Amino acid sequence: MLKQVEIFTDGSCLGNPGPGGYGAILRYRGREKTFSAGYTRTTNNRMELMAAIVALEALKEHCEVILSTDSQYVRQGITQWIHNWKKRGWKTADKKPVKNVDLWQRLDAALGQHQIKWEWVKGHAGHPENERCDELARAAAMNPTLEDTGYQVEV
Ligand SMILES: [Mg+2]
Ligand SMILES: [Mg+2]
């Protein structure tokens, strides 16, 4: 076995677009790290991605990760852009840039460090840690301090 870690993530947004935030918990050997940050203008989907990126980027060795989230958006890109069909050159069928590619590329880079088991949670009652990530993300959205510099009204 490698170092075994559990990651829980969620993102939230008060508008579409509007102030949003992410929350993540990383747990290894009974010790816990929490990550959260709030953005003045973003989307729910970008916050769900950022939560997974930040937690994975915090790992400093090759780990076996169990990554638990309720994000359907995160699942879509795992199935479409970030593992399968990277042959498409980061283009759609009509040869166009994919939405949120800045974050999808950071997620792809972070995932390549680890063995990953996904736990796609059915909404809530998955774990208290998922509920805690939802609280972290909403708390940050209510107190935004950064710009989401990669969010454009147009990409
Ligand atoms: Mg959400
Ligand atoms: Mg949420």
Side-chain angles (χ1 to χ4, degrees), residues 85-101:
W85 280 355
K86 208 110 41 57
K87 191 170 307 172
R88 303 173 304 183
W90 291 89
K91 281 97 72 172
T92 57
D94 285 5
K95 218 61 71 174
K96 318 162 55 59
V98 318
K99 193 160 57 153
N100 298 325
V101 70

Side-chain angles (χ1 to χ4, degrees), residues 10-12 44 48:
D10 199 7
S12 183
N44 173 82
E48 289 181 348

Side-chain angles (χ1 to χ4, degrees), residues 5-11 22-28 31-35 48 50-56 65-70 119 121 126-134 136:
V5 300
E6 298 157 275
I7 289 180
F8 305 84
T9 68
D10 199 7
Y22 67 79
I25 294 180
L26 164 48
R27 184 157 67 203
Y28 162 68
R31 78 155 289 187
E32 217 160 270
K33 290 182 183 178
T34 283
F35 304 85
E48 289 181 348
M50 270 296 284
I53 290 157
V54 164
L56 290 162
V65 174
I66 299 174
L67 196 168
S68 170
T69 177
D70 74 354
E119 190 199 30
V121 309
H127 298 286
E129 293 93 347
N130 302 101
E131 181 167 356
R132 185 143 55 98
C133 283
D134 171 60
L136 279 164

